[PDB]
Design an enzyme around this catalytic site. Structure first.
Site, PDB file in Angstrom:
ATOM      1  N   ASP A   1       0.619  18.138  -8.732  1.00  0.00           N
ATOM      2  CA  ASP A   1       0.095  17.161  -7.382  1.00  0.00           C
ATOM      3  C   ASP A   1       0.424  17.893  -6.287  1.00  0.00           C
ATOM      4  O   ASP A   1       1.643  17.417  -5.729  1.00  0.00           O
ATOM      5  CB  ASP A   1       0.460  15.805  -7.689  1.00  0.00           C
ATOM      6  CG  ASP A   1      -0.419  14.984  -6.942  1.00  0.00           C
ATOM      7  OD1 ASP A   1      -1.340  15.272  -6.179  1.00  0.00           O
ATOM      8  OD2 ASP A   1      -0.127  13.573  -6.943  1.00  0.00           O
TER       9      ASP A   1
ATOM     10  N   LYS B   1       0.756  16.719   0.261  1.00  0.00           N
ATOM     11  CA  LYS B   1       2.045  16.190   0.520  1.00  0.00           C
ATOM     12  C   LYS B   1       2.817  16.886   1.288  1.00  0.00           C
ATOM     13  O   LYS B   1       3.676  17.738   1.327  1.00  0.00           O
ATOM     14  CB  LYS B   1       2.523  16.020  -1.002  1.00  0.00           C
ATOM     15  CG  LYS B   1       1.990  15.165  -1.991  1.00  0.00           C
ATOM     16  CD  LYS B   1       2.479  15.313  -3.292  1.00  0.00           C
ATOM     17  CE  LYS B   1       1.828  14.258  -4.236  1.00  0.00           C
ATOM     18  NZ  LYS B   1       1.881  12.945  -3.894  1.00  0.00           N
TER      19      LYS B   1
ATOM     20  N   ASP C   1       7.930  19.342  -4.274  1.00  0.00           N
ATOM     21  CA  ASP C   1       8.654  20.056  -5.469  1.00  0.00           C
ATOM     22  C   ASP C   1       8.845  19.771  -6.821  1.00  0.00           C
ATOM     23  O   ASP C   1       9.134  20.297  -7.757  1.00  0.00           O
ATOM     24  CB  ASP C   1       9.655  21.076  -4.747  1.00  0.00           C
ATOM     25  CG  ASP C   1      10.793  20.025  -4.315  1.00  0.00           C
ATOM     26  OD1 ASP C   1      10.693  19.028  -3.683  1.00  0.00           O
ATOM     27  OD2 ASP C   1      12.009  20.104  -4.565  1.00  0.00           O
TER      28      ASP C   1
ATOM     29  N   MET D   1       6.758  17.356  -8.228  1.00  0.00           N
ATOM     30  CA  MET D   1       5.393  16.935  -8.864  1.00  0.00           C
ATOM     31  C   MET D   1       4.623  17.722  -9.743  1.00  0.00           C
ATOM     32  O   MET D   1       3.647  17.727 -10.410  1.00  0.00           O
ATOM     33  CB  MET D   1       4.350  17.100  -7.599  1.00  0.00           C
ATOM     34  CG  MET D   1       4.422  16.073  -6.507  1.00  0.00           C
ATOM     35  SD  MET D   1       4.574  14.373  -7.412  1.00  0.00           S
ATOM     36  CE  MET D   1       5.592  13.437  -5.772  1.00  0.00           C
TER      37      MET D   1
ATOM     38  N   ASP E   1       3.895  15.242 -12.725  1.00  0.00           N
ATOM     39  CA  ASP E   1       2.996  14.315 -12.676  1.00  0.00           C
ATOM     40  C   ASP E   1       2.166  14.124 -14.163  1.00  0.00           C
ATOM     41  O   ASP E   1       1.049  13.757 -14.255  1.00  0.00           O
ATOM     42  CB  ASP E   1       2.053  14.651 -11.586  1.00  0.00           C
ATOM     43  CG  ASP E   1       1.475  13.599 -10.840  1.00  0.00           C
ATOM     44  OD1 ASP E   1       2.080  12.053 -11.025  1.00  0.00           O
ATOM     45  OD2 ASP E   1       0.467  13.515 -10.113  1.00  0.00           O
TER      46      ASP E   1
ATOM     47  N   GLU F   1      -5.108  10.652  -6.755  1.00  0.00           N
ATOM     48  CA  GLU F   1      -6.302  11.239  -7.829  1.00  0.00           C
ATOM     49  C   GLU F   1      -5.913  10.779  -9.479  1.00  0.00           C
ATOM     50  O   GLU F   1      -6.657  10.551 -10.262  1.00  0.00           O
ATOM     51  CB  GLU F   1      -5.920  12.793  -8.051  1.00  0.00           C
ATOM     52  CG  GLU F   1      -4.677  13.247  -8.956  1.00  0.00           C
ATOM     53  CD  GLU F   1      -3.357  12.973  -8.133  1.00  0.00           C
ATOM     54  OE1 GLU F   1      -3.443  12.425  -7.043  1.00  0.00           O
ATOM     55  OE2 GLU F   1      -2.406  12.878  -8.745  1.00  0.00           O
TER      56      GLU F   1
ATOM     57  N   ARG G   1      -5.486   7.653 -10.528  1.00  0.00           N
ATOM     58  CA  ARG G   1      -6.187   6.360 -10.894  1.00  0.00           C
ATOM     59  C   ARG G   1      -7.584   6.992 -11.115  1.00  0.00           C
ATOM     60  O   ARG G   1      -8.383   6.233 -12.061  1.00  0.00           O
ATOM     61  CB  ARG G   1      -6.258   5.444  -9.880  1.00  0.00           C
ATOM     62  CG  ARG G   1      -7.080   5.831  -8.646  1.00  0.00           C
ATOM     63  CD  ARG G   1      -6.572   4.942  -7.410  1.00  0.00           C
ATOM     64  NE  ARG G   1      -5.183   5.091  -7.135  1.00  0.00           N
ATOM     65  CZ  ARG G   1      -4.687   4.281  -6.134  1.00  0.00           C
ATOM     66  NH1 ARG G   1      -5.258   3.408  -5.458  1.00  0.00           N
ATOM     67  NH2 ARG G   1      -3.069   4.492  -6.008  1.00  0.00           N
TER      68      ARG G   1
END
Ligand SMILES: CC(C)(C)OC(=O)N[C@H](C(=O)NO)c1ccc(-n2cccn2)cc1
Ligand SMILES: CC(C)(C)OC(=O)N[C@H](C(=O)NO)c1ccc(-n2cccn2)cc1
Ligand SMILES: CC(C)(C)OC(=O)N[C@H](C(=O)NO)c1ccc(-n2cccn2)cc1
Ligand SMILES: [Zn+2]
Ligand SMILES: [Zn+2]
Ligand SMILES: [Zn+2]
Ligand SMILES: [Zn+2]
Ligand SMILES: [Zn+2]
Ligand SMILES: [Zn+2]
Lengths: 513, 518, 511, 95
Positions: free
Chosen positions: B294, B301, B309, B311, B314, B376, B378
Site C-alpha cells: 500500500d 503515504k 515501509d 505496508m 496490508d 483502497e 474497502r
C-alpha cells in the site's frame, strides 16, 4: 460567593444565567389521535412516514374536524410530497371559521421505528418552521409509532433546540403545544419530566457556551452555590488553603499559572428518607484549556473551543438541578468538581514536573495538556473518602474519542461490570448514546515512571483514551467506578453549540439506581 | 501464473518454509501424579504462589530423583520468588552422578492467568531456550490451566521459539540449534494430550500467515501470493480457483480492478473452497484484504507517521484467511462448507493508476466516488463482499488491516469487530475467547451514513468530516451486503508486533475456532 | 548508447563545451623586479596593509611609467584603504600620451591571505571584468602568496569568470592575462596546472548544472565515453545484462522505476611505468533523486535541486580529465560510477523490499530515498574486486551534512587512518576544505535487520551521515577505504550554481 | 569472556579452587554458550562446601580490545543480574 479578580474593570465578574425560559411558559396538551384532530389556532404539523417505499409519497390518515383543511390533506394533494427524512412542507390558509391556520408535515422516512438520531433530524426540521413563524400554538400529530422514552426525547429535543441563547447578544415563542398521539394518557406523565430534563440540559449548555472570561473557577463556583441555594442542596466550596491541607497537589498544580484561584465544588443531595445508595458524581471542570506550556498550537487542536473543557462539571450541575427538582428517595448524591484554569505563566507548572496527589501517589508530568486526569485524580480520591457506593466521573478527556466513536457516541470505561451496565442502561432510557470501551491492563506498563510512582501519560501507546482510564484507575482503591469520556460528543460542531451531554444520562442513572 | 520482472534478479516466488524445526519435535505428555524424571536437557517448572505476591518458590511435584528432590527442597527455593515472568537456572547432579539442568519461570500470585500473562511466561521460557544448545525441553505445570490455555501455551511456544531466516544470506545464525524433544508433566494429562497436535496445526497456520506477511512486496505480490495459495490448496486437496483480469472484467468488479490498475502485477482473485464429506449445515465465506503493498496511490503515504515501509503487511487479512484454510483443510471439520476469498492486488503510483475524484462502478452496480486512493481496502473488499454473497453463504466474515484509527481506539492488543448481525458477532467474540486472540465489539453508527452521500455518484468512498475512520469504513462495506449475516474484523492495529518487529499472524486461530465451534 | 525519449523534443545528449573562452586567454607571468608596464588593458594592483585594519593604500612595485608613477604616488593613494574586497578604478595618460585604466583591490590587513579571503578578492576582481569590455587584464601582486595559493587564485578566477550559457536561447572575454609577481619563475608551472584544474572543476560543474532531462544515465555514460575518447582511458560501460550477470541487486533495484537503463561507468588510467598505488574513485551517480516512493514531498526536501545528486560522479569524471591530461606516473586509477535514476513508477522498488547485493548480503529497504548508499554498495564491491590499494567514494549522500559542517567543509569518513590523512592534506593543498568525522560503531546495532542481513537505514539514530557510513563500511571487506560526503558543499546556493567540488581534491590525492 | 571467532563458544581459562564449580565450567558445558557481546548466563548450584553459589559469564564479543561502548554493554548485562538477584557478594573474573 467569592470575589472574581479582574485585569480591567470591563471584565465580567459573573456568569449570566437564564432560569425562567420561554419553554417554561409553553402550555402542553396531549390528546389521543383516535378521537380525530382539531385545526384552529397556530401551526399543525403531521409526522408521517412510508414503510417500505423509500422516499415515498405523503399520506395523511388522521381525520380532521375541518372541511377546508381536510380538502388540503387529501391524498391527491399530499401525494405530490414525499416522506424523505427531514423533508417538510407547510401552507397558510383559512379554516372553516375564516381563521388563518398553517398546516404541514415532516418526513419520517421509510423505517417504522425512528432512532434517537433520526428523531433529532425530525425536530430540527420542525424547529426550522418554528423559527420562521410568529405562531401562538404548535400542534404535532404523531402518525408514527414511538415509545414513552422516545416521546419524552421528542419533547426534550424540541424544547432544547427551540430555545435560543441570547445572553451575549445586543448591539416570538409559542404559548401552547398540542400533541395528538395514541395512548395519550400513558404519555402524559412524560411531559413535565421532559421540561425538567430540558432545563437541566440547557442549564449545562449555558455554562459550556459561556466564554472563559465569564465562566472561570470563581464565577463558576459561585454559580454552583446559587444553584444549590435555589434547590436547597448542601454546598461547600473549598479554597486553596483548604485544598493545601488536603494535599491535593495534582489538582493544585494545573491551576498554578492562573489568575483565578482553584475552587472545589461539593454539592450534596440527601433524601428525606433512610439513605440506601450513596453516589458521587465527578465532572471535569477546566474553565479553559490552553494546554499549558504544551500549548495547543498544533493544527486541529481547536484552542478556541477549549472553553468547553468544563463540560463534565456542567453535566453534573445539570444533574444536580434535575435531582434537586425531582427529589428522589433513599439516595445521597455528592456533586463534585475540581475547577481550575490551565494557563501559561511564570507560575505555571512545567513538563517533567513531579507532583504528589492527596493519596500520596507521586506523578511525573509528561504533558501539561493532560491536565484533566490530574484534577480528576485528586477529585476521585476525595470522592472515595466520602465512603460512597458508586463513583461516576464525566469529562472531555481525550481527543482520540473523535477517532474511536466520533461525535455521536460517548465512551464509558470502568472497573465494575455491574456499574457499567447501569450506565449503558441509563444511556438507553436517556437516549444519550454511550458505548462500553475496554481498560486494557496490558497497556498499564507504559505508565511506569522511571522516577515517579506513575507516569501522567504514555510516550509510545497511542490508545490515549484507554491509557487515561488506566491512569484514573490508580486513584480508586476499592470502589465501583466508571469513567465517561465525552470529548467527542460534548460540542455540536455543525450547529455551533453545546449539547449539554450527560445531564439526562446521569439523572436516569440516579433515578433508576 | 508467471510473475513479471523488471530485472532478472527480481524474485518470481515467495520462499515458504513448510517443514519447520517445530515439526521435528517429538512431544510427550505425562501425568504429574507419577513423579518427574530428570535426565537430558533443561527441566522447567511453572510455579506460582496464590495470594502472596512476589511469594517464595515451592515445588510441589514429586521428583523421581533423590538428589534433585533435596536440591528442590523448600529451604533451598525460598530465596527465589514467583514474580510473573521471573526465571532461574539450576545446575546439579542426579542420582547417577550425571549433570542435569533445572529451573523455573514465575507465574505470579494470581491463580488464573490471562492471555497476556501466559504470553509473558512463554517469552521467559524462550529466553532460556535461546543462547543454549539443548536437545530436550521438559515443562512441569504446577499451575492450573484449561485445555484452551494449555493449547495456547504450545501455540505461543512454537511460534516464539521459531526463527524466520528465509531472507538471511550471510547473517544466518551459527548457533541456531533447535530442541528435538518436548516433555510435558501435567495434571489429568489424558485430557490434555489431544491439545498437542491441535496446537501444532494452529502453530503453523499462524506461522504460515506470518511468513506471507513478513515477506517483502518484491517477493510477495498478487501473482506470487495467488500461486502460493494454489500450491497450498494442492497440498491440502481443496478446490481452488484463481480469477484473472479477464474474468474480473466479466464480473464487472470495477472497484477492485481500479485499485490495481497502477500495478505491474495483474489482479488475482483467490478462491479456495473446503467442503466436508457430510450433510452441510453452515456455509461460510472468509474474506481477507490482500494488498501486497500500500503506497497509498496518488494519495501517497508521505505524511509523518504513515509508516509506508510497513505496508507489506496490508495482505495480513488474506494471510489470516489462508492460514485458516490450512487449519480447516487439516482438521477437516464436518457439516461445514468454507470459501476462502481474497481480492489481491497492489496499490501503486503510475500513469495507469486511478485518481482521487474518479467515479467507479462496483459489481453490484453501485457507483462510487473515490475521495482517497489510500482508502483502497474497502474498495477491494466491496467487490469481494458482493462475490461472497453470490455464493449463497450463511455468514460473510472479512478481516483486514483497514483503518489506522484502530491504533487510537483499541491499540495494539485488541482487534475491532463490526457487523450487521448480533448473533454472528457473539460467535466471533466467543471464538476470540477460545482462541485467545482478543477482539472488542465496536458500533456501526448509522448517523454517520449521510457523510457518505455523494453529490454525483451513489456513494462516497470516504467521509470528508467524520474522523471515526473505522466506523465510517464499516458503513461503506455494509452497503455491499444486501441480505446476509456479515461481520468485519479490523486488525490494522494488532497485525504487526512493533516491539518484536514481526507479524502476529493474528486472525488465523480466531477464524479456525469460529469455523470449528460452528 | 541510444538515449530513450518520450517525445521527439526530448534531448538525447548533454551539451558540453570543451573549448572555453578561458582557454583562449593568453597568460603571461612576469617578475616584478624590473617594474610594471601598463598602458594596455586594465591594470589592477593587489594591495594590503599589514597591521592597520582599514589602513591607507601604498603601492610598492616600481612602475615603468612617469605619468602613472606620479598618479600612483602615496599622497594620492592615502585617501584609499586596503579593506578586504574594496576595489577602485583610475583614469590617466601614460608615457605615450595614451589613456590607460588602472585600479586596485583591497587584500585586507593580514599579511598572509587565506583561501576564503583570496576567494573574496577574486570575486571583487571578476566584478570589474563583467561590466567592462576589456581586451587584457593585468594583475600586480603586491602581496605574498605561495605557489598553491597562486594556483588557487587562477583556478577561482577562471572558474568565476566563466559563464555557462549552454541553455540560453533568449560576451567579450579578455584575450590576454598578465601577472606581475616576485619569483615569477617558480609560479609559471602553476599556470597550466590551474588551466587544467579549472576545466576539471568546470567540466563537472557543467554536468551537475545540466538538468536531469539532459543529463540521464544513458547520456551521462555516453559523455564519459566521449571524455575517455578525448583522453585515452580504457573504458567499459556495463549494461543491465552485465549487471544482472554481476548480481548487482542493490544498484539495479534503485533504477527499476526509471525509463533509463542503468549504466555503470568504468574508466581507467594506467601509467607507462612500474605501477605503485592502485586507486578506485567511486562517485555517486544519481542523475535525478525524486526519492522514490519515499517521495521528497516534505518541506525542505529541495526536490528541484536533486539534479545535483550525480555531483560525486561529476567530481570523479572531472578528476579523470586532470589525471588523463597531466599523466601521473606509477599509478593505476579506476574511475567508477553506478549511474541510475530514482523515480516513482509501477516498476519502482518499494519501502520494505529486500534486495541482494553483489557480495551476497541481503538488504532491507526502509526508505527508497536512501538510494545512494545502495548504489555505492554494489560499486564498492565492484571496486574491491579490482584489487586496489585505496578506495575513495564521493557522494551527496546525506542532508545532515548541512547541520554538521555546513556549506564550506565536506565530511570524510573511512576505515583507514593513513588514507584519511592523505585526503586531509589533499584538502589543504587543493584548497577544498574537508573535516574528519568519526564512524561511531556503537550505532551499528541500529542496522540489525530482523529478516535481512542488514538494515538500509536506522529507525532511531539521527546521525545520518555516520549511520550511512556504517552501511558502506559493510561492503569493503579488507581494503583502505574513505568516504567523502559532499551533500552540503556541492551546490553554491548563494551563486545559484555548482562548485564542481572534489575534482581538485581528488586530483591532488592522485598526484 | 571473549572469543578472538565471532559469536564464538565460551571458554573459561582460569583455575577455580572448587571441584563442583570446576565441573560446571568445563569446556563442554560452557561451549553450549556463545560470546555475543552482552549475552550472559548464570546458574545456581552447590559448591564443594555444599554452599549455594551462582556462577555465570558475560560475553565480550570477538574483539580483543573493548571500547567504552563495548564495556558499557558488558556492565549493563551484569547489572541486570544484580537487580534480579538478592546477592551478598559479586565476583568478577577478568579474562
Ligand atoms: C494525547 C494527549 C494526552 C496529548 O491529548 C489527549 O489525549 N487529550 C487532550 C487533552 O488532554 N486535553 O486536556 C485533548 C482532549 C480533547 C480534545 N478535544 C478536541 C476536540 C474535542 N476534544 C483535544 C485534545
Ligand atoms: C481513509 C483514511 C484516509 C481515513 O484512512 C486511511 O487511509 N488509512 C490507511 C489505509 O491505507 N487504509 O487502507 C491506513 C491503514 C492502516 C494503517 N496502519 C498503520 C499501522 C497499522 N495500520 C495506516 C493507514
Ligand atoms: C534517509 C536519510 C534521512 C537518512 O537521509 C536522506 O534522506 N538523504 C537524502 C537522499 O536523498 N539521499 O540519497 C538527502 C537529503 C538531503 C540532501 N541534501 C540537501 C541539501 C543538500 N543535500 C541530500 C540527500
Ligand atoms: Zn488539555
Ligand atoms: Zn482538558
Ligand atoms: Zn491504503
Ligand atoms: Zn490498505
Ligand atoms: Zn535520495
Ligand atoms: Zn541521493
Amino acid at each position: 460567593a467569592s470575589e472574581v479578580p479582574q485585569v480591567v474593570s470591563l471584565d465580567p465578574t459573573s456568569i449570566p444565567i437564564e432560569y425562567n425560559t420561554p419553554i417554561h411558559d409553553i402550555k402542553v396538551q396531549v390528546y389521543d389521535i383516535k378521537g380525530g384532530c382539531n385545526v384552529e389556532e397556530g401551526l399543525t404539523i403531521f409526522l408521517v412516514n412510508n414503510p417500505g417505499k423509500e422516499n415515498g409519497p405523503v399520506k395523511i390518515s388522521s381525520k380532521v374536524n375541518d372541511k377546508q383543511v381536510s380538502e388540503f390533506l387529501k391524498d391527491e394533494n399530499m401525494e405530490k410530497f414525499n416522506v424523505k427524512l427531514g423533508t417538510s412542507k407547510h401552507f397558510y390558509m383559512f379554516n372553516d371559521n375564516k381563521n388563518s391556520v398553517a398546516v404541514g408535515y415532516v418526513g419520517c422516512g421509510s423505517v417504522a421505528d425512528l432512532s434517537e438520531a433520526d428523531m433529532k433530524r425530525v425536530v430540527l426540521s420542525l424547529v426550522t418552521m418554528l423559527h420562521d413563524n410568529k405562531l401562538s400554538k404548535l400542534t404535532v400529530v404523531f402518525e408514527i409509532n414511538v415509545d414513552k422514552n422516545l416521546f419524552r426525547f421528542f419533547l426534550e429535543t424540541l424544547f432544547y433546540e427551540y430555545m435560543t441563547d441570547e445572553r451575549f447578544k445586543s448591539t416570538e415563542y409559542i404559548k401552547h403545544l398540542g400533541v395528538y398521539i395514541n395512548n395519550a394518557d400513558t404519555y402524559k406523565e412524560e411531559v413535565e419530566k421532559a421540561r425538567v430534563y430540558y432545563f437541566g440540559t440547557y442549564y449545562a449548555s449555558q455554562l459550556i457556551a459561556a466564554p472563559s472570561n465569564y465562566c472561570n473557577p470563581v464565577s463558576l463556583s459561585n454559580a454552583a452555590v446559587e444553584l444549590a441555594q435555589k434547590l436547597n442542596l448542601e454546598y461547600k466550596i473549598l479554597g486553596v488553603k483548604e485544598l493545601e491541607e488536603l494535599k491535593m497537589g495534582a489538582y493544585l498544580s494545573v491551576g498554578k499559572g492562573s489568575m483565578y484561584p482553584n475552587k472545589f465544588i461539593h454539592l450534596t443531595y440527601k433524601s428525606k428518607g433512610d439513605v440506601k445508595k450513596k453516589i458521587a458524581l465527578v465532572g471535569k471542570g477546566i474553565t479553559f484549556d490552553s494546554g499549558g506550556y504544551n500549548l495547543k498550537a498544533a493544527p486541529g487542536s481547536m484552542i478556541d473551543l477549549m472553553k468547553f473543557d468544563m463540560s463534565g462539571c456542567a453535566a453534573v450541575l445539570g444533574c444536580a438541578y434535575c435531582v434537586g427538582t425531582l427529589k428522589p428517595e433513599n439516595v445521597e448524591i455528592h456533586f463534585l468538581s475540581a475547577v481550575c484554569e490551565n494557563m501559561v505563566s511564570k507560575n505555571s507548572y512545567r513538563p517533567g514536573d513531579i507532583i504528589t496527589a492527596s493519596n500520596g501517589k507521586t506523578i511525573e508530568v509528561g504533558n501539561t495538556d493532560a491536565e484533566g486526569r490530574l484534577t480528576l485524580a485528586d477529585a476521585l480520591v476525595y470522592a472515595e473518602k466520602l465512603g460512597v457506593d458508586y463513583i461516576v466521573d464525566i469529562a472531555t478527556l481525550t481527543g482520540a474519542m473523535l477517532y474511536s466513536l466520533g461525535t455521536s457516541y460517548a465512551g464509558v470505561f470502568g472497573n465494575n461490570e455491574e456499574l457499567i451496565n447501569k450506565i449503558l442502561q441509563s444511556s438507553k432510557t436517556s437516549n444519550e448514546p454511550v458505548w462500553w470501551l475496554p481498560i486494557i491492563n496490558e497497556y498499564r506498563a507504559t505508565l511506569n515512571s522511571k522516577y515517579a510512582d506513575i507516569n501522567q501519560i504514555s510516550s509510545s501507546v497511542k490508545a490515549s483514551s484507554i491509557v487515561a482510564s488506566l491512569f484514573l484507575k490508580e486513584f480508586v482503591q476499592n470502589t465501583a467506578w466508571a469513567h465517561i469520556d465525552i470529548a467527542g460528543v460534548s460540542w455540536n460542531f455543525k450547529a455551533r453549540k453545546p449539547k449539554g451531554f450527560g445531564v439526562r444520562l446521569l439523572t436516569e442513572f440516579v433515578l433508576n439506581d
